[PDB]
Amino acid sequence: DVAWYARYPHILEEATRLPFAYPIGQYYDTGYSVASATEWSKYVDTSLTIPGVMCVNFTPTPGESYNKNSPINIAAQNVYTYVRHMNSGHANYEQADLMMYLLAMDSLYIFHSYVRKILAISKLYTPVNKYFPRALLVALGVDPEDVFANQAQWEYFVNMVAYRAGAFAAPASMTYYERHAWMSNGLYVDQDVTRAQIYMFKPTMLWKYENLGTTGTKLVPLMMPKAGDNRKLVDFQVLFNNLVSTMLGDEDFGIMSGDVFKAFGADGLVKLLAVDSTTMTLPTYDPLILAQIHSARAVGAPILETSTLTGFPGRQWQITQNPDVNNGAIIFHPSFGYDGQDHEELSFRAMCSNMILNLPGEAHSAEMIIEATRLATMFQVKAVPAGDTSKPVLYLPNGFGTEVVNDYTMISVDKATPHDLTIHTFFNNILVPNAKENYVANLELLNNIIQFDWAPQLYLTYGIAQESFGPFAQLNDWTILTGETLARMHEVCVTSMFDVPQMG
Amino acid sequence: DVAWYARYPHILEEATRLPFAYPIGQYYDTGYSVASATEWSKYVDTSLTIPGVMCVNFTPTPGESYNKNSPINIAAQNVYTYVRHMNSGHANYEQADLMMYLLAMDSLYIFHSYVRKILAISKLYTPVNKYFPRALLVALGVDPEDVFANQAQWEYFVNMVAYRAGAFAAPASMTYYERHAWMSNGLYVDQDVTRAQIYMFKPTMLWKYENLGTTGTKLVPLMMPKAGDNRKLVDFQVLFNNLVSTMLGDEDFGIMSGDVFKAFGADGLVKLLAVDSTTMTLPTYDPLILAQIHSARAVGAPILETSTLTGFPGRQWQITQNPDVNNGAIIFHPSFGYDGQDHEELSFRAMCSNMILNLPGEAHSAEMIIEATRLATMFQVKAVPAGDTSKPVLYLPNGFGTEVVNDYTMISVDKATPHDLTIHTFFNNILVPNAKENYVANLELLNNIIQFDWAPQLYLTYGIAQESFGPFAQLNDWTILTGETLARMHEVCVTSMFDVPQMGFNK
Amino acid sequence: LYTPVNKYFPRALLVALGVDPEDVFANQAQWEYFVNMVAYRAGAFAAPASMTYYERHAWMSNGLYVDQDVTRAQIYMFKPTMLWKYENLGTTGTKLVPLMMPKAGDNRKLVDFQVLFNNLVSTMLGDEDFGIMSGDVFKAFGADGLVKLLAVDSTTMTLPTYDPLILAQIHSARAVGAPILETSTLTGFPGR
Amino acid sequence: PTPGESYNKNSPINIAAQNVYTYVRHMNSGHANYEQADLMMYLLAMDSLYIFHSYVRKILAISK
Amino acid sequence: DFGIMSGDVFKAFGADGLVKLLAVDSTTMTLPTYDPLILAQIHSARAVGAPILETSTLTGFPGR
């Protein structure tokens, strides 16, 4: 093409010998091309910080359940007539007791995968990614130095969680457990390179069993460590020791576990992976899970019994089953759009438009479309507040998958000295108030987010413009997705997750 | 991995069944998921405007030149020895006259590539892309209906330009002409998909030859139409007549044309190929062009003789030579950082840090690194104002390639009714003043830019915070590049461009 | 169904069934999803295939019948006037109450058939006692001895067949009148 | 140019509208912001476009 | 609506399954052919009269 380069190849060789592959996890100063430009102090951005970790903070859901015609009540009927017709005898439980046992088993398995990922991250080292492993330990909520100093007690605790939770039976033919294990036991790169950026899934809350005696059962939230909490082994021990406190030496739980063990054999049970001081998970490339992260759609913080919601009493998230309410059905319709305060976070107004399903290539199979929409949750109506005065605005969806996303947490390095880890928590929607300092901070966050390849699509509202701007994402072959289509897809995937191949 | 999907493929098949692959070029409303959210009117964005065209607006340069060791002066000597001494040419001109002639031929050929791209775009229609052809005719600065209504006159004017250009001789093996012709005659997709984003290259100005007799020879800028101009064929004909008026009566150019014809033969000359009614251009995929456009770094507006720059009296862009000045050297030493107004575009302070050069993959071959840095131009020093009251801030580079980028022009559809085409021009640096209708407009700008795949890196200055943000791009495999390294790569690529291998040396 | 020599295909057969024909053409994929979901929800229950009640009702209901074996023949269909709707009376037993179907020329949409299905199986779809009875029937009569439901795959097309056995029943058919409902006004006949 | 005579749904133009809307919309996953009559009106306007083209190119080819 | 329908017909029928108007050049000649089917149409062709317009005055037939 150029005949001069073939005549002087040494000139072209030595002139373009540049050091590439800068290690990520570091602050880099670019310097000045105009030496005089130090008189223009903040007008010259000589800084460069590449992020490494985006943790998707999820909540495991049973799907939306208003009555007995719900997919998990139908699945409760199906698994109860399966288990009851292998364990002939006098059962002392209903459909709903067995299905709430099978839902508490999922929170136990996700907790085991969570602490096992805490151990398996701590052995990760790469000289070209300085986020390994302390940023992945900060994003999970643990104190990284506590895992390094107290390694053998952490390994004993994780092996004891796998031995205690492994004493119970849960059917492996239910793909609910396999999907949650695939999300929780996974380190995912956004691009298949060496200095790639890492996606993680972490449970925001887990579902805590409590037997209400005559008035049924309840699954109440148990909150997990958020990022930057510096939680020690004693805190995770307290979390495990009130997660299984109602279950570990219990009569009825043992009867249900033995019934599930006789119905589904030992080869058809959910297995727990053990640790042996050499267990090391490696960051894999999985474009199926990156499509779900791209179409992920945050719903807000969980509402608890202690949460203050002015105008919304009794809106806490719970999987309830009362025999005197809704014909004894498992009930779960959580209210979304809550961010932890009483101020009407009005970035959630930007989620009231229809979503964009962005997806790569030109040919999109049915499994790809049904898998990419798993973390997508669109609001449908406003929740009606109880009272004339109401400080927040809540929303009701048109259904949701087996997980909803509560938050995302980004880990990058600080551009000021010392260059420690910065933790940024955000929804898909981001409010930018009218202040001087948060415009360039929102630019920092936006450029940090676009470093991640198939990142969630952002919505940005402004204070003085009084308007949201729509999907901030690079598009592809896209489509506009409506609430009834996503509701049908959610129905299909809640049905497929809890399906057991039966004999009757 | 989900066994239920294989046992019920029909339910999964009627469950998804989505539209998929909307034609780009038109506005799309997403609608509401919460139907009562019309009470929160502007706080819900239901709009979807996918852009189609980013036009890179460039200036053809001979490289930076302030002494005899410039690549343009070494090339002038090297081609004057071949024409004058090795081939027994005439002795009524020097090497700088021959190189000015060789530089004016480039502007002639760039004009030809420009108008034949205007010709070939106007026949492009497809159902999947409603930007074709009208947005691409708008980005080049023409009336899109004039090229439809006067297609035969356009088609014969392009051929007449190519036939009139045969009055002059210029060597074909000199890669300067080949690079400019290939650059200004291409539509480039950013992704190689069906409905991709289009990249173009338009000249901001061309170089017009001016004879001065005893006091040398200039090349002055002749401005090309910008993207909102709606220029007809009569305007482009007046531009071509203005470009060749000082060239066909010049006896020095007649002697130099005969000398280049005699030295390089007839088959060793630049031939502009004739087009016909079936001549179609198609948007290709080229990862080298995208590697140029990513890390392309804009310099600002060309400075003219009638441009008001307080504190910088004579600083217009001109390729000059004078036998008294600098012992007959060709001098092109332009000032950068001008935006067309008599003020300081203080977002150009964000271009005063070292550039980032990120590439795809991890290979990074040597010619890939020399090609990815062609349109990258870093500043080195401020210009010194002549006086005490200076309104703008001008900059001096550390060399540049054969093209500098002036700005970029993006063509998208309007968010509001009647959803016409929107023309936004911007540098790599973008200033956001503290007003209500600047933040969401800049956010629309940013999201329209990130639709383009290997886009230029943006530097966003916020006047409220007095703080610029650095490279707004996603980085894959990057280096921090200093000015001496880019200067070395520039000297290499400009030396290779003006090399004429048709001289039969051993070498 | 399409034939250039019978212009009653398919709009007259859709009007006679009570559906809006244009709603089935415009909303084809949602209709197919609804029918596959009815076959998946009702197919979760067990009913013995050795009981010829189900096979006779499926032979009447899944059937297009010509009166003569020709090309421009005339079509017989069977459509349920009403269906039997379950309601558990608790201590006082059980009851099957009528659920009326769309009559001809009603222009009913997919939402109306969804409402009909969603109060047909509302007392049954996540129920304890129904699941126990279905599991008992599944263990008694095996999986090969259960009533199967034919699925649709966007190519399912029934063709008008000639069956002189069903035409003999149509010839000797003998209409009994409208069903009496709880809202029906029968002067001199209470509780009928 | 006529689409034939049409006063009810059994017209050949209405049967053709249904038959082409099923192929474009349902068999090929088209968009859902139009009905079959819009698609057939579009398909009928394309015919007038093509007849205009044949008309002016006959004017062209006759004059030589 | 026509842009969406054009994209849908393009996607449904491909690019080679569409009506292509062929380009003519300076050497494009039409020649009068002999066709007995066209003559069989023109014989027994039966005229209907003028098209009725919105501005056409037809007393007793207001909108027709």
- HEC per residue, B430-475: EEECCCHHHHHHHHHHHHHHCCCCCCCCEEEEECCCCEEEEEECCC
Structure tokens at B498: 């003006």
CB atoms < 10 A from the CB of B478, how many? 21
Sort out which chain D residues have CB atoms less than 8 A from B22's CB and list them: 31
**Kind and range of the H or E element at E13?**
helix E2-13
Structure tokens at A414: 């600080």
Sort out which chain C residues have CB atoms less than 8 A from D15's CB and list them: 2
* Nearest in space to A223 (alpha carbons), one of A53, A421, A57, A393: A57
Radius of gyration of chain C (CA): 19
Does the N-terminal peptide bond of residue B23 adopt cis geometry, omega within 30 degrees of 0?
no
- Do the chains contact at B8 and C37, CB–CB below 8 Å? no
**Kind and range of the H or E element at B4?**
helix B3-7
d(CA A54, CA A411): 6
What per-residue string of b and e applies to C108-122 under the rule 16 or more CB within 10 Å gives b?
bbbebbeebbeebbb
Structure tokens at A116: 């096992």
Amino acid in position B121: I
Q: Does C162 contact B at CB distance below 8 Å?
A: no
Q: Are B37 and A349 in contact (CB under 8 A)?
A: yes
Give the chain C residue nearest B17 (alpha carbons): C29
* Nearest in space to A254 (alpha carbons), one of A101, A86, A103: A101
Q: Does B5 contact C at CB distance below 8 Å?
A: no
d(CA B380, CA B378): 7
Residue C175 exposed, middle or buried by CB count within 10 Å (0-12, 13-18, 19+): exposed
CB atoms < 10 A from the CB of A481, how many? 22
What per-residue string of b and e applies to B276-302 under the rule 16 or more CB within 10 Å gives b?
eeeeebebeeebebbbbbbbbbbbbbb
Amino acid in position A210: E
**Kind and range of the H or E element at B403?**
strand B403-413
Interface of D with C in 13-42 (CB under 8 A): 15, 18-19, 21-22, 26, 35-36
Q: At residue B149, what are phi and psi to the nearest 5 degrees? A: -85, -15
**Contact residues for B456 (Cβ-Cβ < 8 A; gap 6+):** B293, B294, B295, B296, B297, B298, B405, B408, B428
Sort out which chain D residues have CB atoms less than 8 A from C7's CB and list them: 10
d(CA A293, CA D33): 29
Structure tokens at E11: 């996607």
- The single residue listed with the structure tokens 């380190």 is A187
d(CA B14, CA A491): 13
d(CA A427, CA A415): 23
CB atoms < 10 A from the CB of E5, how many? 21
| Cα Dmax for chain A | 92
Q: Are A256 and A263 in contact (CB under 8 A)?
A: no
CA angle (C174 as vertex; C170, C179 as ends), nearest 5: 115
* Nearest in space to B72 (alpha carbons), one of B503, B495, B507: B495
Best of A69, A489, A498 to disrupt the C interface by mutation (most C CBs within 10 Å)?
Answer: A69
Structure tokens at A42: 């903040």
* Nearest in space to A397 (alpha carbons), one of A408, A417, A382: A382
d(CA A190, CA A154): 29
**Kind and range of the H or E element at A47?**
strand A47-49
Q: Are A283 and A189 in contact (CB under 8 A)?
A: yes
H-type helices in D1-64, by residue range? 12-21, 36-62
What number of CA atoms fall less than 13 Å from residue A351's CA on the CB side?
33
Sort out which chain B residues have CB atoms less than 8 A from C30's CB and list them: 14
* Nearest in space to A370 (alpha carbons), one of A187, A497, A268: A497
Structure tokens at C49: 């295939």
d(CA A199, CA A293): 9
Of E2, E11, E28, the CB nearest to D42: E2
d(CA B478, CA A193): 14
Q: Are A35 and A181 in contact (CB under 8 A)?
A: no
Of B25, B127, B277, the CB nearest to E25: B277
- E and B interact (at least 3 Cβ pairs within 8 A): yes
Residue E37 exposed, middle or buried by CB count within 10 Å (0-12, 13-18, 19+): exposed
d(CA E39, CA A192): 70
- Looking at residue A179, the DSSP 8-state letter turns out to be H
Amino acid in position B500: V
Of A69, A85, A328, the CB nearest to C125: A69
Amino acid in position C139: K
Nearest chain B CA: its distance from E61 CA (Å): 39
d(CA E63, CA A406): 62
Give the chain B residue nearest A472 (alpha carbons): B447
Sort out which chain B residues have CB atoms less than 8 A from A193's CB and list them: 362, 476
Experimental method: cryo-EM
Does the N-terminal peptide bond of residue B418 adopt cis geometry, omega within 30 degrees of 0?
yes
Of B45, B436, B467, the CB nearest to A42: B467
Nearest chain E CA: its distance from D10 CA (Å): 22
d(CA A93, CA C131): 14
Crossing angle for the helix pair B95-121 and B251-264, to the nearest 10 degrees: 80
Give the SS3 label for residue B296: coil
CB atoms < 10 A from the CB of B186, how many? 18
d(CA B394, CA B334): 10
Length, in residues, of chain E: 64
What per-residue string of b and e applies to A224-240 under the rule 16 or more CB within 10 Å gives b?
bbbbbeebbbebbeebb
Pairing of strands A379-382, A395-397: antiparallel
How many Å separate Cα B275 from the centre of its chain?
Answer: 23
Q: At residue A56, what are phi and psi to the nearest 5 degrees? A: -85, 115
Nearest chain C CA: its distance from A405 CA (Å): 28
Nearest chain E CA: its distance from D39 CA (Å): 7
- Do the chains contact at C131 and A70, CB–CB below 8 Å? no
Q: Does B8 contact C at CB distance below 8 Å?
A: yes
CA angle (C141 as vertex; C135, C145 as ends), nearest 5: 120
Radius of gyration of chain E (CA): 21
Rounded alpha-carbon distances, angstroms, from residue B209 to B203, B304, B319: 17, 15, 9
Nearest chain B CA: its distance from C7 CA (Å): 29
Amino acid in position E8: D
What per-residue string of b and e applies to B234-273 under the rule 16 or more CB within 10 Å gives b?
ebbeebbeebbeebeeeebbebbbebbbebbeeebbbebe
Rounded alpha-carbon distances, angstroms, from residue A389 to A2, A348, C190: 75, 19, 53
CA angle (B316 as vertex; B310, B320 as ends), nearest 5: 150
Give the SS3 label for residue D34: coil
Residue B125 exposed, middle or buried by CB count within 10 Å (0-12, 13-18, 19+): exposed
- Do the chains contact at D24 and E2, CB–CB below 8 Å? no
Q: Are A201 and A186 in contact (CB under 8 A)?
A: yes
Residue B203 exposed, middle or buried by CB count within 10 Å (0-12, 13-18, 19+): buried
Radius of gyration of chain D (CA): 16
Give the chain B residue nearest C33 (alpha carbons): B14
Chains near A with 3+ CB pairs less than 8 A apart are B, C
Sort out which chain E residues have CB atoms less than 8 A from D41's CB and list them: none
CB atoms < 10 A from the CB of A82, how many? 24
Nearest chain B CA: its distance from A109 CA (Å): 19
Residue B69 exposed, middle or buried by CB count within 10 Å (0-12, 13-18, 19+): exposed
- The single residue listed with the structure tokens 């929409």 is A373
Give the SS3 label for residue C166: helix
Radius of gyration of chain B (CA): 25
Give the SS3 label for residue C56: helix
- Do the chains contact at A496 and B4, CB–CB below 8 Å? yes
